[PDB]
Amino acid sequence: SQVLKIRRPDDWHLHLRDGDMLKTVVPYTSEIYGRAIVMPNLAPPVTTVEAAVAYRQRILDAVPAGHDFTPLMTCYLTDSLDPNELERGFNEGVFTAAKLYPANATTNSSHGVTSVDAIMPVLERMEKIGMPLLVHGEVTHADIDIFDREARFIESVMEPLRQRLTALKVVFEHITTKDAADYVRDGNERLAATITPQHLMFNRNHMLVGGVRPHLYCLPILKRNIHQQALRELVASGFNRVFLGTDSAPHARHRKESSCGCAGCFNAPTALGSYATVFEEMNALQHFEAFCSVNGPQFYGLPVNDTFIELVREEQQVAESIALTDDTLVPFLAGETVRWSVK
Amino acid sequence: SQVLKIRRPDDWHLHLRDGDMLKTVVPYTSEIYGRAIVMPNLAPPVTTVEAAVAYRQRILDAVPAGHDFTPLMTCYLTDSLDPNELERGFNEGVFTAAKLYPANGVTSVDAIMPVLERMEKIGMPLLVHGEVTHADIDIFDREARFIESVMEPLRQRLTALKVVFEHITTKDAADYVRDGNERLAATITPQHLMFNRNHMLVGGVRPHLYCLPILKRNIHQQALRELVASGFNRVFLGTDSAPHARHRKESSCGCAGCFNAPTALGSYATVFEEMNALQHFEAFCSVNGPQFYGLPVNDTFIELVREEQQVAESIALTDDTLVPFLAGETVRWSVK
Ligand SMILES: O=C(O)c1[nH]c(=O)[nH]c(=O)c1F
Ligand SMILES: O=C(O)c1[nH]c(=O)[nH]c(=O)c1F
Ligand SMILES: [Zn+2]
Ligand SMILES: [Zn+2]
Ligand SMILES: [Zn+2]
Ligand SMILES: [Zn+2]
C-alpha cells in the first residue's frame, strides 16, 4: 500500500471563523498543518493588533491538546486603517501579512477599501517594512461578468500596483485562471500564488451540469476547463512560487443549500489527500512536497517544518456531514471515496 | 395606471408535471393562457397516444371551471419510436408536435430519421431542446455547438421540416433564427430576457434562477431582448415554467427549472416596455405562435395593469412548498 512521506505541511490560506464554528473546524487543520494563514474576514473584521491578538488566543484555545499548530494572523485592509497600527502588528509578530479584498466605493471605511489608490499610504508602509500583501484578485463592478472578474483584476489593478510598488511582495490568492497562472509564472521573485484543491480538481461543469452544486460554489468562481488545466500544469511544472492554500471556508448547511447560497468549500478535512491525487494524475509527485511544505515558507521567509507526515493510498470514505452546535457542516467531497489519506 | 389590452396569450413551451404538483400548477396557466404546449418529459415519458390521452385528461380534470384552457400535447421522441404511433397520434389530434431531447432522450438524429422524415411529410412541427451533452463540452457552449453539429445539418437534410428552436439563450441562436427561413422559429422564456448568469451567481448562488439551458453572458441576454423587440415574427412566448419542490431546488444538487407561470406574462411586459417595444408585445404573446403552428389566434382579450403586484414568497404543496420565480419580489405589470 503506497506511501508518501512529506515534511509537515502548512495552509497558506484559511478561514477559521469564530465562536462555535471555530471550535469545530480548528482541529481539521491543526492535526495536519504546522501553520496556517488565518484570514481576517470576521464580522467585524480583524483590523487592529488587539483584535488579532484576541482572535489568535481563541484559535489557540480550540486547538486539541498535543497538536503543534501555530496560527499566523492577518490584517484586513480598510480605507480607515492606520499605517502605524499595521506596522506595529507586523513588528510585534502579530500580523504575518495583510489581505486586500476587492474594492467597492460603497464599502464602509471600517470594513474595506474604496480603491487601491485610496490606500497607498498603507501599501507603501508594507513595501517599506517587507510585509507581504495577499490579494483576493477580483474587480466587483456590476457590469463585469463573474467569470471575467479575475482577468480584469490582473490588468486594471494587479499590474498597475506592482508596477508602482516594485519592492512589494504579493501573493495572488486562490488563482483560478490561465490568465493568473501565466501572469504568476512570468512574474518575478516578489510574486507568488496559492491554489485550492477545488480549482485543481474541478471546473464549472462540475458545479452546473446535471444540477446546481452549491458546495462547489466558492469565490473566485470555478472557470472553464482550459483554466483548470492551466492550473494543474502550473503546479505539475514544479514552479516554486505556487503553494498550498486551501481557502477552507466553512458555512452551516442551511446557508449553503438556500435560495442564496454562501460561497466557500469546507475542504480542510480532505484538501491534502486531494492535492496528492492531483499531483499523481499529473505524474508530478516529485513536486508535491515543495508545494505543500517548502514554497510557502521560502516566499514568506519562514522555516520549513522539520517533522514529517505520511499519506497512504488507502481509499477512505469522506463523512456525509460534521456536527456543529446548531446545524451541520457538509465537508468538501462529502460521502465520496478519497484516494489518499493521512496515516 | 397604464393598462395594456392584448389578445389572450398562449404558452408554446410548458411543464405541467403530474399528480399533486399538476393540480397546484395548472391554474396559474389555465387562468391566463388559452392554450399551452405541454411537454412530455414525465417519469416515465409520454411516448404513446394512450399515455397522452390520459395525460391530457389528468390536465383537464385540474382546470378550474370557468377557465377556457386547451392543453396541446407532445410526443417524447425516442430512438426506437415507431413513426406510425407518432403519426396516428397526429392524425387523431392528440399530438400537436414532437419534442427532441438529446440523451442526457434521443441518441442521434440518424437513429430517428424515419420518424423525422415522417414528421416532415405530414407537416408535424419538431420542437428541439438544442444542446449537445458530451462531457467534454463546457455547459455554456452546448447551445452554440448544437447549432453547427445538429440543427443546421438536420435542416439541410429535411428542407421542409418545421422546427421550433425552444428556449433560446444565445446570440448564436438569436442570429441563426433571425436569419433562418419560414420553417424555423423559436421560443424565449422570461428569465433569459430579464437576467444573465451574473444574477444566478453574484452575491450568492441562486438555485431558483438555475435552469436549462443555462443563463449566459449579458451579450447573449442583450441579443435576445433585441430579437423580441425588433418585431421578428417567428419568436413567441414559451415560458418553460418548470416547477420543482423547494427542497429539490435548495439542496446539495438543485434541479434545473424556473417556476415562472405565475409571473411570466407581467415579466415579458416589463421587458418589452423597457425595450420601447410594447407594440410588438401582443404578437409575441398571442399571434406569432399560432401563425407558426397554423392555428387560429384566440378570440378573447385580457388586460395588464402597470400596478406593482408582489410575488408570493411560496406556494403550498401537499409536502414542502413551491417557490415562484421572483418570489417576494415586485413585478411591475399584473393581469387585471
Ligand atoms: O470567507 C468566505 O466565506 C469566502 N468564501 C469564498 O468562497 N471566497 C472568499 O473570498 C471568501 F472570503
Ligand atoms: O423539465 C425540467 O425540469 C427542465 N428544466 C429545465 O430547466 N430545462 C429543461 O430542458 C427541462 F426539461
Ligand atoms: Zn478570497
Ligand atoms: Zn479566502
Ligand atoms: Zn428544454
Ligand atoms: Zn422545457
XYZ file of C-alpha atoms and ligand atoms in Angstrom:
707
model
C 0.000 0.000 0.000
C 1.779 3.122 -1.367
C 3.135 5.828 0.935
C 4.016 9.498 0.624
C 6.119 10.991 3.393
C 6.375 14.796 3.277
C 7.586 17.421 5.680
C 4.575 18.559 7.676
C 2.504 20.938 5.550
C 1.226 24.493 6.164
C -2.024 26.051 4.892
C -1.242 29.491 3.413
C -4.945 30.486 3.079
C -7.512 29.554 5.715
C -10.875 30.665 7.204
C -11.373 29.536 10.797
C -14.378 31.755 11.592
C -15.069 32.277 15.281
C -17.133 31.131 18.289
C -18.509 27.599 17.976
C -17.806 27.250 14.272
C -14.144 27.835 15.121
C -14.121 25.235 17.905
C -15.427 22.671 15.364
C -13.223 23.444 12.375
C -9.862 24.181 14.066
C -8.978 20.511 14.657
C -9.234 19.586 10.964
C -6.370 21.996 10.287
C -4.312 21.653 13.498
C -3.944 17.841 13.337
C -2.321 18.133 9.869
C -0.811 21.551 9.236
C 2.027 23.134 11.208
C 0.975 26.676 10.472
C -1.870 28.449 8.693
C -2.534 31.890 7.319
C -5.756 32.814 9.170
C -7.804 35.190 7.039
C -9.239 38.331 8.633
C -12.821 38.407 7.327
C -14.695 38.208 10.584
C -17.799 40.293 11.404
C -16.472 42.755 12.423
C -13.198 42.206 10.560
C -9.767 41.958 12.173
C -8.213 45.384 11.598
C -6.321 46.002 14.865
C -3.398 44.389 16.648
C -5.573 43.956 19.741
C -8.323 42.135 17.831
C -5.743 39.908 16.115
C -4.129 39.007 19.451
C -7.501 38.107 20.961
C -8.519 36.147 17.846
C -5.257 34.237 17.966
C -5.914 33.149 21.566
C -9.428 31.902 20.729
C -7.801 29.855 17.972
C -5.119 28.526 20.340
C -7.864 27.693 22.927
C -9.623 25.474 20.386
C -6.516 23.501 19.350
C -6.720 19.923 20.707
C -4.033 19.004 23.234
C -0.876 17.637 21.597
C -1.414 19.330 18.214
C 1.512 21.545 17.229
C -0.340 24.289 15.415
C 0.538 27.982 15.089
C -1.974 30.370 13.533
C -0.446 33.179 11.500
C -2.696 36.242 11.731
C -3.592 38.813 9.065
C -4.889 42.365 8.908
C -8.000 43.158 6.827
C -7.027 46.271 4.866
C -9.554 49.141 5.087
C -9.618 52.802 3.996
C -9.535 53.807 7.714
C -6.606 51.531 8.642
C -3.767 53.473 10.248
C -0.438 52.512 8.628
C 1.181 52.744 12.116
C -1.252 50.175 13.504
C -0.419 47.703 10.747
C 3.313 48.290 11.239
C 3.189 47.781 14.994
C 1.325 44.491 14.381
C 3.944 43.375 11.849
C 6.811 44.451 14.126
C 5.197 42.648 17.132
C 4.782 39.489 15.079
C 1.021 39.729 15.430
C 0.425 40.303 11.669
C 2.238 37.951 9.344
C 0.555 39.559 6.309
C -2.238 41.860 5.123
C -5.202 40.847 2.991
C -6.787 43.027 0.318
C -10.355 42.110 -0.602
C -11.948 43.549 -3.763
C -12.604 47.277 -3.702
C -16.011 48.947 -3.709
C -16.843 52.670 -3.488
C -19.922 51.605 -1.477
C -17.909 49.958 1.314
C -17.765 51.480 4.787
C -14.255 52.751 5.605
C -14.131 50.439 8.660
C -14.996 47.339 6.633
C -12.984 47.680 3.450
C -11.280 49.555 0.686
C -12.874 52.008 -1.817
C -9.916 51.699 -4.167
C -6.229 50.789 -4.119
C -5.395 54.418 -4.849
C -7.059 55.352 -1.545
C -4.836 53.047 0.496
C -1.393 53.890 -0.963
C -0.049 55.053 2.391
C -0.682 51.616 3.972
C 0.646 49.738 0.895
C 3.796 51.893 0.891
C 4.390 51.026 4.565
C 4.063 47.340 3.675
C 6.602 47.679 0.840
C 8.915 49.613 3.186
C 8.914 47.049 6.023
C 8.628 43.979 3.705
C 5.160 42.847 4.765
C 3.514 40.555 2.203
C 0.218 41.603 0.614
C -2.290 38.838 -0.042
C -4.801 39.703 -2.706
C -8.244 38.291 -3.489
C -7.832 39.297 -7.150
C -11.261 40.293 -8.466
C -12.966 43.506 -9.561
C -16.619 43.556 -8.441
C -18.178 46.156 -10.761
C -21.765 45.122 -11.511
C -21.244 45.236 -15.290
C -18.326 42.783 -15.294
C -19.243 39.165 -15.918
C -18.354 36.980 -12.899
C -16.085 34.680 -14.988
C -14.116 37.799 -16.183
C -13.526 39.335 -12.722
C -10.096 37.827 -12.107
C -8.610 38.504 -15.533
C -9.884 42.065 -15.303
C -8.247 42.484 -11.867
C -4.880 41.492 -13.314
C -4.924 44.206 -15.964
C -6.628 47.024 -14.139
C -5.337 46.559 -10.536
C -2.560 43.973 -10.049
C -0.106 45.085 -12.724
C -0.531 48.824 -12.164
C 0.010 48.166 -8.432
C 3.133 46.028 -8.859
C 4.498 48.499 -11.389
C 4.047 51.244 -8.761
C 5.302 49.386 -5.660
C 8.223 47.458 -7.049
C 9.547 46.112 -3.747
C 6.119 44.813 -2.574
C 5.812 41.039 -2.029
C 2.421 39.821 -3.258
C 0.529 36.559 -3.069
C -2.132 36.252 -5.726
C -4.531 34.131 -3.593
C -6.549 31.207 -4.962
C -5.905 31.792 -8.660
C -8.453 30.231 -10.979
C -7.452 31.222 -14.493
C -4.808 30.712 -17.087
C -4.578 34.493 -17.079
C -3.400 34.362 -13.424
C -1.354 31.215 -13.974
C 0.676 32.803 -16.794
C 0.866 36.149 -15.042
C 2.325 34.458 -11.977
C 4.562 32.093 -13.951
C 6.032 35.081 -15.812
C 6.467 37.160 -12.678
C 9.432 37.971 -10.520
C 10.535 36.683 -7.129
C 8.177 39.095 -5.313
C 5.060 37.446 -6.793
C 3.523 34.096 -5.774
C 0.128 32.326 -5.697
C -1.964 29.837 -3.735
C -4.284 27.288 -5.369
C -7.217 25.446 -3.705
C -7.893 21.798 -4.230
C -11.284 22.526 -5.906
C -9.766 24.690 -8.642
C -7.361 21.878 -9.477
C -9.834 19.054 -9.305
C -12.898 20.591 -10.917
C -14.160 23.173 -13.369
C -17.534 24.938 -13.748
C -19.196 21.931 -15.400
C -18.789 20.039 -12.092
C -20.852 22.789 -10.365
C -23.520 23.191 -13.065
C -24.014 20.170 -15.326
C -26.922 17.911 -14.228
C -27.745 20.066 -11.174
C -26.595 23.066 -9.238
C -23.984 22.173 -6.622
C -23.633 24.957 -4.038
C -20.910 23.019 -2.140
C -18.728 23.603 -5.199
C -19.823 27.288 -5.182
C -16.993 29.491 -3.998
C -15.138 32.685 -4.993
C -13.391 33.158 -7.253
C -15.892 31.067 -9.266
C -14.789 27.799 -10.901
C -13.892 28.538 -14.553
C -13.993 26.585 -17.819
C -11.729 23.547 -18.160
C -8.960 25.341 -20.092
C -8.363 27.270 -16.881
C -8.437 24.172 -14.644
C -5.856 22.609 -16.992
C -3.565 25.693 -16.922
C -3.610 25.469 -13.099
C -2.826 21.775 -12.986
C 0.009 22.276 -15.472
C 1.432 25.061 -13.351
C 1.697 23.014 -10.110
C 2.845 19.938 -12.090
C 5.650 22.038 -13.667
C 7.427 22.330 -10.284
C 7.136 26.126 -10.356
C 8.229 27.203 -6.901
C 6.165 30.328 -6.252
C 2.939 28.439 -6.093
C 1.950 26.821 -2.842
C -0.845 25.243 -0.828
C -3.722 27.430 0.331
C -6.960 25.576 0.831
C -9.261 28.553 1.175
C -11.227 26.273 3.520
C -14.270 28.411 4.098
C -16.995 26.682 6.106
C -20.708 27.576 6.147
C -23.542 25.829 8.003
C -25.561 23.566 5.720
C -28.688 25.775 5.712
C -26.589 28.738 4.490
C -25.132 26.698 1.603
C -28.323 24.930 0.473
C -30.501 28.063 0.478
C -32.240 30.310 -2.084
C -28.999 32.257 -1.995
C -26.058 30.024 -1.130
C -22.906 31.349 0.530
C -19.566 30.959 -1.278
C -16.923 28.640 0.172
C -15.896 24.976 0.337
C -15.084 23.304 3.701
C -12.068 21.467 2.341
C -9.720 21.341 5.360
C -10.624 17.670 6.086
C -9.892 16.467 2.524
C -7.616 19.024 0.874
C -4.221 17.344 1.478
C -5.237 13.994 0.019
C -6.949 15.833 -2.832
C -3.786 17.745 -3.797
C -1.883 14.437 -3.605
C -4.415 12.826 -6.007
C -3.873 15.767 -8.445
C -0.067 15.643 -8.391
C -0.286 11.885 -9.047
C -2.629 12.312 -12.019
C -0.296 14.948 -13.413
C 2.645 12.498 -12.963
C 4.286 15.070 -10.701
C 4.580 13.726 -7.144
C 8.211 14.807 -7.194
C 6.872 18.369 -6.746
C 4.090 17.641 -4.226
C 6.158 18.164 -1.046
C 7.522 21.532 -2.204
C 4.013 22.775 -2.937
C 2.708 21.685 0.494
C 5.725 22.293 2.721
C 8.540 24.346 1.123
C 7.458 27.008 -1.421
C 5.230 28.863 1.077
C 7.876 29.160 3.804
C 10.537 30.321 1.313
C 8.267 33.070 -0.014
C 7.340 34.205 3.486
C 10.907 33.935 4.812
C 9.946 31.310 7.413
C 11.435 27.932 8.360
C 10.475 24.703 6.731
C 8.745 22.322 9.141
C 11.231 19.711 10.474
C 8.693 16.986 11.297
C 7.125 14.630 8.776
C 3.718 13.306 7.916
C 2.678 10.317 5.768
C -0.181 9.862 3.309
C -1.261 6.354 2.325
C -3.054 5.351 -0.876
C -5.828 3.650 1.083
C -9.328 4.505 -0.081
C -11.334 6.205 2.643
C -14.940 7.493 2.635
C -15.497 11.150 3.493
C -18.138 11.828 6.156
C -21.548 12.932 4.842
C -21.593 15.735 7.450
C -19.934 17.205 10.511
C -21.968 18.245 13.508
C -21.961 21.794 14.920
C -23.783 23.107 17.959
C -26.921 24.056 15.963
C -26.652 22.918 12.306
C -24.267 20.645 10.409
C -21.367 21.273 8.115
C -21.016 19.407 4.788
C -17.367 18.778 4.025
C -15.847 19.143 0.583
C -16.374 15.806 -1.204
C -18.852 14.585 1.458
C -19.737 10.876 1.205
C -17.129 10.223 -1.519
C -14.155 7.835 -1.570
C -10.917 9.838 -1.439
C -7.723 8.154 -2.813
C -5.035 9.344 -0.380
C -5.471 9.541 3.383
C -3.218 10.734 6.256
C -1.815 7.737 8.169
C -52.450 53.409 -14.065
C -51.408 52.290 -17.568
C -53.500 49.407 -18.956
C -52.382 47.205 -21.826
C -55.086 45.135 -23.543
C -53.933 42.153 -25.574
C -55.475 39.181 -27.305
C -55.442 36.178 -24.935
C -51.965 34.649 -24.994
C -50.811 31.020 -25.270
C -47.716 29.310 -23.809
C -45.791 27.394 -26.501
C -43.464 25.708 -24.006
C -44.860 24.448 -20.653
C -44.030 21.844 -17.961
C -47.115 20.797 -16.038
C -45.633 17.743 -14.277
C -48.188 15.270 -12.934
C -50.149 14.306 -9.806
C -50.436 16.743 -6.878
C -47.932 19.152 -8.462
C -50.025 19.250 -11.648
C -53.132 20.138 -9.569
C -51.231 23.038 -7.922
C -49.607 24.441 -11.094
C -52.213 24.238 -13.921
C -54.422 27.058 -12.554
C -51.511 29.518 -12.852
C -51.566 28.694 -16.588
C -55.231 27.878 -17.319
C -56.460 31.179 -15.813
C -54.424 33.263 -18.298
C -53.397 31.283 -21.402
C -55.843 29.983 -23.989
C -53.598 27.107 -24.998
C -50.276 25.602 -23.937
C -47.741 23.219 -25.467
C -47.411 20.649 -22.656
C -44.031 18.940 -22.836
C -43.810 15.138 -22.472
C -40.882 14.714 -20.034
C -42.868 12.768 -17.422
C -41.321 9.869 -15.495
C -41.964 7.743 -17.489
C -42.189 9.993 -20.591
C -45.217 10.420 -22.873
C -44.224 8.287 -25.856
C -47.659 6.970 -26.950
C -51.114 8.291 -27.863
C -52.791 6.451 -24.967
C -50.378 7.984 -22.422
C -51.090 11.402 -23.961
C -54.871 10.968 -23.967
C -54.753 10.018 -20.279
C -52.306 12.832 -19.583
C -54.484 15.394 -21.347
C -57.425 14.286 -19.197
C -55.433 14.454 -15.965
C -54.650 18.025 -17.034
C -58.272 18.880 -17.925
C -59.558 17.447 -14.597
C -57.430 20.010 -12.700
C -58.536 23.041 -14.793
C -60.884 25.206 -12.695
C -64.374 25.635 -14.179
C -64.667 28.973 -15.964
C -61.087 28.795 -17.246
C -61.117 28.104 -21.010
C -57.778 26.319 -21.444
C -56.750 23.717 -24.054
C -53.519 21.709 -23.477
C -51.695 20.861 -26.724
C -49.987 17.506 -26.210
C -46.500 16.428 -27.403
C -44.761 13.097 -28.056
C -41.459 12.347 -26.299
C -39.162 11.282 -29.176
C -37.080 8.115 -28.606
C -34.572 6.199 -30.753
C -36.944 3.261 -31.247
C -40.173 5.260 -31.608
C -42.481 3.884 -34.269
C -43.336 6.575 -36.858
C -46.885 5.139 -37.110
C -47.527 5.843 -33.391
C -46.321 9.444 -33.820
C -48.485 9.830 -36.926
C -51.703 8.174 -35.735
C -51.370 10.457 -32.686
C -51.060 13.462 -35.009
C -53.963 12.435 -37.256
C -56.257 11.977 -34.178
C -55.490 15.434 -32.773
C -53.608 14.009 -29.752
C -50.059 15.122 -30.615
C -49.667 18.729 -31.726
C -45.887 18.235 -32.050
C -42.926 16.015 -31.088
C -40.126 17.132 -28.731
C -36.475 16.236 -29.181
C -34.376 15.911 -26.013
C -30.764 14.912 -26.594
C -29.989 11.914 -24.339
C -28.733 13.457 -21.032
C -33.919 11.096 -24.613
C -32.702 10.713 -28.232
C -29.226 9.339 -29.072
C -28.764 10.803 -32.538
C -30.762 12.282 -35.433
C -29.633 9.310 -37.584
C -31.425 6.869 -35.239
C -34.795 8.595 -35.689
C -34.624 9.697 -39.327
C -37.707 7.639 -40.279
C -39.641 9.478 -37.584
C -38.266 12.902 -38.657
C -38.963 12.134 -42.315
C -42.498 11.144 -41.326
C -42.983 14.404 -39.466
C -41.772 16.403 -42.470
C -44.135 14.620 -44.851
C -47.218 15.036 -42.619
C -46.196 18.568 -41.587
C -45.806 17.959 -37.877
C -43.531 20.517 -36.191
C -40.376 19.425 -34.344
C -39.558 21.145 -31.059
C -35.889 20.990 -30.060
C -34.041 21.282 -26.767
C -30.925 22.365 -28.700
C -27.885 21.442 -26.631
C -25.177 18.840 -27.016
C -24.442 16.756 -23.913
C -20.909 15.474 -24.317
C -18.925 15.727 -21.071
C -16.024 17.408 -22.859
C -18.222 20.346 -23.799
C -18.407 23.322 -21.414
C -22.004 23.894 -20.291
C -22.077 27.452 -21.707
C -21.134 26.183 -25.192
C -23.694 23.404 -25.515
C -26.291 25.519 -27.339
C -23.901 27.054 -29.944
C -22.400 23.635 -30.520
C -25.773 22.072 -31.106
C -26.479 24.507 -33.921
C -23.422 23.694 -36.002
C -23.365 19.940 -35.178
C -27.065 19.008 -35.105
C -29.518 21.778 -36.077
C -28.019 23.072 -39.320
C -27.188 19.602 -40.796
C -30.677 18.400 -39.814
C -32.440 21.295 -41.574
C -30.350 20.835 -44.749
C -31.297 17.152 -44.810
C -35.013 17.847 -44.219
C -35.731 21.039 -46.181
C -39.491 21.012 -45.429
C -39.355 20.206 -41.715
C -40.784 22.842 -39.364
C -38.602 23.386 -36.311
C -39.124 25.322 -33.084
C -35.768 26.064 -31.505
C -37.012 26.019 -27.908
C -35.925 28.425 -25.149
C -33.040 30.037 -26.988
C -30.429 31.591 -24.710
C -27.606 32.856 -27.001
C -26.796 35.416 -29.651
C -25.743 32.416 -31.719
C -29.294 31.065 -31.675
C -30.819 34.531 -31.999
C -28.831 35.250 -35.176
C -29.395 31.705 -36.529
C -33.141 32.065 -36.008
C -33.367 35.650 -37.232
C -31.568 34.613 -40.452
C -33.450 31.338 -40.927
C -36.458 30.679 -43.130
C -40.202 30.464 -42.552
C -39.830 26.856 -41.296
C -37.721 27.856 -38.281
C -38.992 29.579 -35.168
C -38.006 29.905 -31.505
C -39.439 30.383 -28.062
C -37.898 32.547 -25.369
C -38.502 32.429 -21.600
C -38.910 35.362 -19.233
C -35.684 34.563 -17.314
C -33.449 34.553 -20.415
C -34.734 38.076 -21.203
C -34.662 39.508 -17.650
C -31.392 38.020 -16.400
C -27.901 36.810 -17.298
C -25.574 34.431 -15.427
C -24.422 37.206 -13.021
C -27.911 37.178 -11.485
C -27.641 33.470 -10.636
C -24.031 33.609 -9.287
C -23.060 37.019 -7.899
C -23.524 37.745 -4.178
C -24.599 34.107 -3.700
C -25.781 31.173 -5.815
C -29.476 31.242 -6.693
C -30.969 27.791 -7.412
C -34.275 29.386 -8.415
C -32.567 31.053 -11.380
C -30.937 27.704 -12.231
C -32.486 26.198 -15.345
C -31.502 24.719 -18.675
C -30.265 25.933 -20.982
C -28.121 27.875 -18.505
C -28.211 31.653 -18.305
C -25.397 33.022 -20.373
C -23.391 36.273 -20.526
C -25.084 39.661 -20.836
C -24.141 39.907 -24.539
C -26.369 36.867 -25.100
C -29.152 38.287 -22.993
C -28.991 41.578 -24.884
C -29.159 39.665 -28.173
C -32.435 38.063 -27.018
C -34.077 41.307 -25.864
C -33.179 42.909 -29.193
C -34.628 39.927 -31.094
C -38.046 40.141 -29.445
C -38.080 43.950 -29.594
C -37.297 44.027 -33.322
C -40.740 42.559 -34.016
C -39.331 39.465 -35.695
C -42.431 37.278 -36.066
C -41.025 33.778 -35.635
C -40.240 34.302 -31.987
C -43.024 33.679 -29.488
C -43.937 33.203 -25.831
C -42.803 29.859 -24.315
C -42.230 30.206 -20.537
C -40.557 26.864 -19.864
C -42.272 27.061 -16.479
C -40.619 24.070 -14.820
C -41.691 23.637 -11.200
C -39.679 21.699 -8.551
C -40.390 21.446 -4.809
C -38.425 23.976 -2.733
C -36.015 21.455 -1.253
C -35.348 19.851 -4.599
C -34.225 23.319 -5.681
C -32.457 24.171 -2.375
C -30.380 21.007 -1.975
C -26.756 19.902 -2.443
C -27.811 19.200 -6.057
C -30.557 21.539 -7.205
C -32.886 20.633 -10.080
C -32.924 22.898 -13.099
C -36.140 24.827 -13.781
C -37.840 28.141 -13.071
C -41.481 28.132 -11.911
C -42.390 31.274 -13.785
C -46.052 30.694 -14.844
C -47.480 32.972 -12.090
C -45.218 35.857 -13.165
C -44.032 35.291 -16.757
C -46.602 37.431 -18.612
C -46.020 40.502 -16.424
C -42.263 39.949 -16.689
C -42.422 39.827 -20.500
C -44.474 43.057 -20.430
C -41.622 44.692 -18.454
C -39.027 43.528 -20.984
C -40.997 44.854 -23.972
C -41.669 48.188 -22.179
C -38.011 48.551 -21.205
C -37.154 47.924 -24.869
C -39.538 50.662 -26.151
C -41.336 47.892 -27.991
C -44.795 47.258 -26.437
C -46.292 47.496 -29.934
C -44.735 44.064 -30.555
C -45.826 42.550 -27.268
C -49.228 41.218 -28.388
C -47.837 39.458 -31.464
C -45.125 37.725 -29.400
C -47.730 36.545 -26.834
C -50.815 35.883 -28.969
C -50.147 35.786 -32.778
C -46.676 34.516 -33.833
C -47.066 31.099 -32.221
C -50.499 30.439 -33.722
C -49.272 31.555 -37.151
C -46.253 29.243 -36.970
C -48.305 26.270 -35.792
C -51.085 27.107 -38.295
C -53.708 27.575 -35.562
C -56.279 30.380 -35.136
C -55.480 33.244 -32.790
C -57.503 33.351 -29.579
C -60.692 35.408 -29.828
C -60.758 36.746 -26.277
C -58.713 39.515 -24.669
C -57.086 40.132 -21.307
C -55.654 43.260 -19.649
C -52.375 44.051 -17.891
C -52.174 46.936 -15.404
C -48.932 48.751 -14.579
C -49.524 48.278 -10.868
C -46.794 46.777 -8.665
C -48.212 43.370 -7.626
C -45.869 41.490 -5.251
C -44.973 37.857 -5.832
C -45.726 35.344 -3.092
C -42.722 34.003 -1.133
C -44.041 30.453 -1.578
C -46.993 28.355 -2.761
C -48.224 25.437 -0.646
C -47.962 21.831 -1.893
C -49.027 18.632 -0.053
C -45.452 18.333 1.272
C -42.864 21.107 1.053
C -43.643 24.305 -0.875
C -43.064 25.743 -4.334
C -41.018 28.933 -4.669
C -42.174 31.057 -7.605
C -39.765 32.731 -9.980
C -39.151 36.210 -8.444
C -40.566 35.127 -5.042
C -41.098 38.023 -2.623
C -40.216 40.455 -5.393
C -42.093 43.295 -7.011
C -43.460 42.803 -10.520
C -44.293 45.989 -12.427
C -47.213 44.691 -14.541
C -50.043 42.434 -13.407
C -53.050 40.796 -15.028
C -56.270 42.719 -14.362
O -14.908 33.638 3.612
C -15.696 33.179 2.775
O -16.877 32.814 3.027
C -15.210 33.149 1.380
N -15.549 32.180 0.534
C -15.124 32.174 -0.741
O -15.500 31.229 -1.476
N -14.332 33.137 -1.242
C -13.934 34.178 -0.495
O -13.203 35.079 -0.929
C -14.350 34.247 0.910
F -13.989 35.272 1.701
O -38.297 19.628 -17.057
C -37.425 20.294 -16.476
O -37.314 20.319 -15.228
C -36.476 21.100 -17.297
N -35.886 22.173 -16.753
C -35.028 22.942 -17.430
O -34.527 23.924 -16.825
N -34.700 22.682 -18.710
C -35.206 21.640 -19.371
O -34.886 21.429 -20.551
C -36.171 20.740 -18.703
F -36.713 19.668 -19.337
Zn -10.663 35.120 -1.435
Zn -10.307 33.124 1.436
Zn -35.697 22.296 -22.696
Zn -38.858 22.626 -21.169
